[PDB]
Amino acid sequence: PQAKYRHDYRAPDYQITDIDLTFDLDAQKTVVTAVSQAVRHGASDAPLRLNGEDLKLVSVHINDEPWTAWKEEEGALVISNLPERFTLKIINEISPAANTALEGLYQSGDALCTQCEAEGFRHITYYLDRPDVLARFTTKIIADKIKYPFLLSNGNRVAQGELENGRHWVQWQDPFPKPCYLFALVAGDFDVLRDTFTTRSGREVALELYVDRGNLDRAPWAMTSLKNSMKWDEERFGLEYDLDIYMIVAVDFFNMGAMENKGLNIFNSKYVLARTDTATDKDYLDIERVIGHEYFHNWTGNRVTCRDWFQLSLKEGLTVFRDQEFSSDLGSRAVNRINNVRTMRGLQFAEDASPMAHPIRPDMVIEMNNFYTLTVYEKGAEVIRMIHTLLGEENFQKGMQLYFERHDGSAATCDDFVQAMEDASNVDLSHFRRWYSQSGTPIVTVKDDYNPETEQYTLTISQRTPATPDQAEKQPLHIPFAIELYDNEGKVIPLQKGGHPVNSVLNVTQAEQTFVFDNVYFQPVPALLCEFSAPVKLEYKWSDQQLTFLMRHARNDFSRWDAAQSLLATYIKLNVARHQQGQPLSLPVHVADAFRAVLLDEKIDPALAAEILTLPSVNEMAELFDIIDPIAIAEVREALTRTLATELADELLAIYNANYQSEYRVEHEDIAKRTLRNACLRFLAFGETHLADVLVSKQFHEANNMTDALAALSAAVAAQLPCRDALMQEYDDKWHQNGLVMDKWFILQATSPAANVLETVRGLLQHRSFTMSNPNRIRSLIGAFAGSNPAAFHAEDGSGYLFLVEMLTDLNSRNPQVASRLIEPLIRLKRYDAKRQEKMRAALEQLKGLENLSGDLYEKITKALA
Ligand SMILES: NCC[C@H](N)C(=O)O
Ligand code: NA
């Protein structure tokens, strides 16, 4: 498989301006006719090269003339001797039912649907499958009426007919030119929830949400979230929907979460269907986030698209930032920021220190589906958020307006977006552009000094980014470094220098730089990198007391949580080194007191308390260490949880009882009380056994929603309580026929701390609700074991690696995209001790010798073995 390079981008030799598609649909053999109006921009002797994969060509005509000047090659139809303008007509066959990879046109249960991003359209017909080619589509679909009474494609329904033999057809027309990755087609039988939204200028938009028959009762929340998304985009960005219908289809067999096809989003039903007894608060909030994200793509993705795939972050960073601002405006900003930062420090940082590290705008790519990554998305969004921090809201919105003004209707690059922000705001972003082309996480070291004679505080800040596997050369970045200085009463000390106020967002642009502040009338406690104002690691020598003081006084809730994380980091590292020497947990009394203070503070927002009482996950704990000891980390997390359960037992039970709510509401204050209550329950599960067992079975049996029941069932598994098997068996008996609900149970099984967890997980491959043909089930059972049970996955006898090797041997042929999500834990081998490295290397050598090794796995395995 061959690498492609961003520096090789060239404008295409041919454009397509319009395409008329006819699908004669059938699950075994679908016939596709594609009539394209084309224009040659390059030399008369450059042929038209169309991408195509697994297509059976039936005919080629140019202006209606059967064409003899063509040939098929590896992945392409190359057509010569073309005039300057012509109609290309292609007829080809494909086979949806054989498509197990779920790319192109495939079968989802009884429905047919598509996935074309990034490069799936070439699995449907020969085309210029690249996002700088934009064309007006019209799509005519012909199918069996009893099996496919709904026939959907992008845009408006412009024609319909009946035929003999029980067939019918529908034609669709989408007036906006689109690159073909945004093409969609859905055929099948659905219940439809219909509603309307009226934009602020008075366009009425029909909203339609297609779900499997019998599922209409799980649809209103997605519909509500959609209207909330459309309203928010109007109020915050000034953006209205641009068409008359908005369709969403929920399908069960989907690889990528959800997809922004113009006017016809396709969603994994995991991000549509919610009922209070099947879905948790976190499901509700993810449904809202993903409905928003795909809706926000309508502008940042669809009206302005990507010139080439290396520009994926242009739409993803910007749309993730938009879905974050959305969730944050509607819910708790601090809680959102906190969870986004946990993802950054615990999952994205690890990727940026792995063999797959890449800049948010990659330079080289073998399989473009490997690059739907935490880096492109989440670090991409941190990059957009730093532009926001540097510009302020008003300038940022002006940049947005300029970007759409210059680029509405075409494919753009990241550099174009930066340039629009720079021109509209007058803030210079040429050094800042380096965040697009450099990978790895910067490390920012802060030293400080307080001068009592001059009342001056001096920060000496330095940065460097260690080399990564992909780039030997690294340079300083333009790092926005926000600070606050606190006096002894907890009040903010005004930042100033030489009689002039100073912006508290410092511009750290050099390897090393000093900043001096005047009129600092008391020795300050600093809050550093506030609101995680750049995605960097902070190295600063805090005292425990500086941290507990920030916990008590910092102005922003994010800083309070974050001071608590640095407080815990020190003791997490101490206790991991202790675990390696055979020693028990050691924690000073004053740290346990700081969390007691949080439990009993009556003014603190419960949402904030809940987050401070949620320990760093094993993945965030892993980023504290050069070499990861996954067993020590897991046992330490447990023991820390037992220690605080013991020390704070009375406080925990009291706060748990005070936050009891008899009504269930999907409302931010209620969610917050419920999160705090279940964070308490989790500790209680780890205290005295008998009481634990009682609290937990009791919550499980009395819960009136899946949030409270799952938190119980989950604490029973984690703490291996006596009632565990009985509760687990009840959930199976009640929920087995429901895949989305069972996913939560597979997750608990996969991440259990029980000694025989691998054995159970292997037995679950045979379970009535598991199947290898469904990505959601594969991820819930196998991916959760490999990626979320690191203690068991990295068992010393290497049984975890062998297991993943068997599964990936199946998946490499069945569904390479899912194979490639699942291999990720094995490609981190260099973070582990020599003996685990050697087995992981052996497992990767084994996969490397597979017969038809997919490009997706090939790219990752060779970077890992390098
Ligand atoms: N655009 C690809 C699909 C992905 N889940 C997204 O919404 O960005
Ligand atoms: Na808010």
Ligand code: NA
């Ligand atoms: Na100092």
Ligand SMILES: [Zn+2]
């Ligand atoms: Zn997206």
